[PDB]
Amino acid sequence: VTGIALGMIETRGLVPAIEAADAMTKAAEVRLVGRQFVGGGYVTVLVRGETGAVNAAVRAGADACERVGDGLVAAHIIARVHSEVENILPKAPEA
Amino acid sequence: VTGIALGMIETRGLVPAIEAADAMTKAAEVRLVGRQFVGGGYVTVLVRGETGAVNAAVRAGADACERVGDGLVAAHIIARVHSEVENILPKAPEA
Amino acid sequence: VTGIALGMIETRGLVPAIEAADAMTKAAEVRLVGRQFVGGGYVTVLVRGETGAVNAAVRAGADACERVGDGLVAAHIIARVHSEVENILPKAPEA
Amino acid sequence: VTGIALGMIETRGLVPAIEAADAMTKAAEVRLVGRQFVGGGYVTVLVRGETGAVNAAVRAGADACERVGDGLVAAHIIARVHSEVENILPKAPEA
Amino acid sequence: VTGIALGMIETRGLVPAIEAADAMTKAAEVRLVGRQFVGGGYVTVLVRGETGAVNAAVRAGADACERVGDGLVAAHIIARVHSEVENILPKAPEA
Amino acid sequence: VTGIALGMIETRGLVPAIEAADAMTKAAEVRLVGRQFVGGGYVTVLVRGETGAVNAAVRAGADACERVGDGLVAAHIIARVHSEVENILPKAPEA
């Protein structure tokens, strides 16, 4: 796979997170690299790919959870992070 | 057992979670694979099975906690996740 | 002791939790098997016994904390959980 | 020292907790056996002693933090817990 | 250094905490002995010194963060804690 | 690199945090030294540099997340912390 764009969707609840997480990977060719628990209820999900692929993922992921549980927080794409920032980005999630 | 659909119910409180967790397994043939603490008070419960089995579980689990403690958050079914997503799904809960 | 019913009281604060925890064990013959911190402020307390014993525990535990600190969240009894669910139930609390 | 009554004060903030914690021990002869972080912002402080000693502690501790930071949550005394309950009570706090 | 008074400022956010933490040490001769995360968003910062030194620290620290981020929670001085209470006070923060 | 000014942006959500984190490093020459989870939903991001560099970073980082997810909390610069304070500042984030 090996694109490096970043898709991110932030939710309130893990349940919306997991639909997001899944609709995203069903959408385009992304890699789910992280699911984090931020405290306070937000959960983020994070996937990497090429730019087209990651643009689609997030769109699809957005309108999939927007009404699941307590809903969507943000949904956002950095087509190319800076190497400085990959030091806080996970490689693969913790199962 | 070995179905792979996913049942998920998100709650506010562990106490509603545990009724959910139990009414679900009493309902159909599902496996309780996870109970997670999301921070901020939501707790999720997660079970796997075949599709029929997991459709029933969640329905039953929903109307069982909807009035327990602080109540139900979401209740949702992914009849078939993508392997990318099983990397954040637990296999069995932590006792 | 060795009943298997379940008593559960959910609170907002540990202080209400501990009165609950104590009035419960003073009430009937239950075993305090868990005190968990759910994040977000709820704390749950959990005890096992026979059915009569655990019915009484919770009643007594309820009206004991209902006005302690930030108060009672839920109070609820599963006279018989399913073995699937004992995989998230603790055996004895962590001191 | 070795009384076994229990004094408990629950706060919103550690800062009110620490004034409580200190005014309490200055008040009567109690032992500070625990300071716990409950998540969600409440912090509890817990001390043991004889009954007179622990009655005074809490009174003094109450009106000492009631206006510190975000304030007092509860303040409560179990003159004698049940041994079942000492399994969730700490022996000495974690420094 | 080795005074034993205690300065404490509680905040909502780490960012106000860190300005506090710094304006305090710039103010008088205190030792930053702790920065704790209380859950729920409050963060506390804690410094030791002589009494004059620690009185000044906190004043300076107060009006420095009162408008940073989500702001100041409390700000408070125990000129002399009881040894019972030093069992919950850290010696030096965790970097 | 090796400046020692400090840039800090506090957010509500990790997703705004990560845009901040990235726009900052794209802005000037800073080092991302930390991303912390404060509990309760705030997340902070922290970078070091020279003064000019770190002034720019934060400005850029501010108006980049102000509308991402749940948004910006604070945004703040200590051109020179005190060595006492570097004992709570991380050296490099945890990946």
Q: From CA B24, how far away is CA B46, in angstroms rounded?
A: 10
β-strands B5-12, B42-49: how paired? antiparallel
Kindly give, in sequence order, each residue whose CB lies less than 8 Å from that of residue F83, ignoring residues fewer than 6 positions away.
none
Residue of D nearest to B40 (CA): D40
Q: From CA E18, how far away is CA E61, in angstroms rounded?
A: 10
Q: From CA D53, how far away is CA D7, in angstroms rounded?
A: 9
Question: How many CA within 13 A on the CB side of residue C6?
Answer: 23
Q: What does the buried/exposed string (b/e) look like for E60-83 if buried means 16 or more CB atoms within 10 Å of the residue's CB?
A: bbbebbeebbbebbbbbbbeebbe
For tokens 């906690």, name the residue: B65
Both tokens assigned to B44? 């999720």
CATH fold of F1-87: Alpha-Beta Plaits (3.30.70)
Residue of B nearest to D40 (CA): B40
What 3-state class would DSSP assign to E19? helix
C6–chain E nearest CA distance, Å: 30
Q: Whats the size of chain E, residue-wise?
A: 95
Q: From CA B88, how far away is CA C32, in angstroms rounded?
A: 32
Element (H, E) at F62: helix F51-65
The identity of residue B57, as a single letter, is A
How crowded is residue F74: how many other Cβ atoms within 10 Å of its Cβ? 24
CB contacts, 8 Å: B13 with chain C:
10, 38, 42, 44, 73-74
B40–chain D nearest CA distance, Å: 7
Contact yes or no for C32/C94 (Cβ under 8 A)? no
What experiment produced this structure?
X-ray
Q: Whats the size of chain F, residue-wise?
A: 95
Q: Does the CA dihedral A67-A69-A74-A80 come out positive or negative?
A: negative
Closest residue to D74, CB basis, from C16, C38, C95? C16
Cβ separation C22–D73 shorter than 8 A: no
C86 contact D CB<8A: no
Contact yes or no for C35/C17 (Cβ under 8 A)? yes
Query: What is the 3-state secondary structure of F12-44?
Result: ECHHHHHHHHHHHHHHCCCEEEEEEECCCCEEE
How buried is residue E25: exposed, middle or buried, by Cβ count under 10 Å (0-12/13-18/19+)? buried
Phi and psi, residue A68, nearest 5°? -80, 130
Domain boundaries, chain C: 1-87
Residue of A nearest to F13 (CA): A42
Q: What are the residues facing E13 on neighbouring strands? A: none
Q: What are the residues facing D23 on neighbouring strands? A: none
Size of interface C-E (CB pairs under 8 A): 3
B39–chain D nearest CA distance, Å: 8
The identity of residue A16, as a single letter, is P
What 3-state class would DSSP assign to E45? strand
C39–chain A nearest CA distance, Å: 8
For tokens 């109690």, name the residue: D30
Query: What is the 3-state secondary structure of A44-80?
Result: EEEEEECHHHHHHHHHHHHHHHCCCCCCEEEEEEECC
A94 contact C CB<8A: no
Contact yes or no for F16/A74 (Cβ under 8 A)? yes
Cα first-last separation, chain E? 20
**Max Cα-Cα span within chain E:** 35
Q: Whats the size of chain A, residue-wise?
A: 95
C39 contact A CB<8A: yes
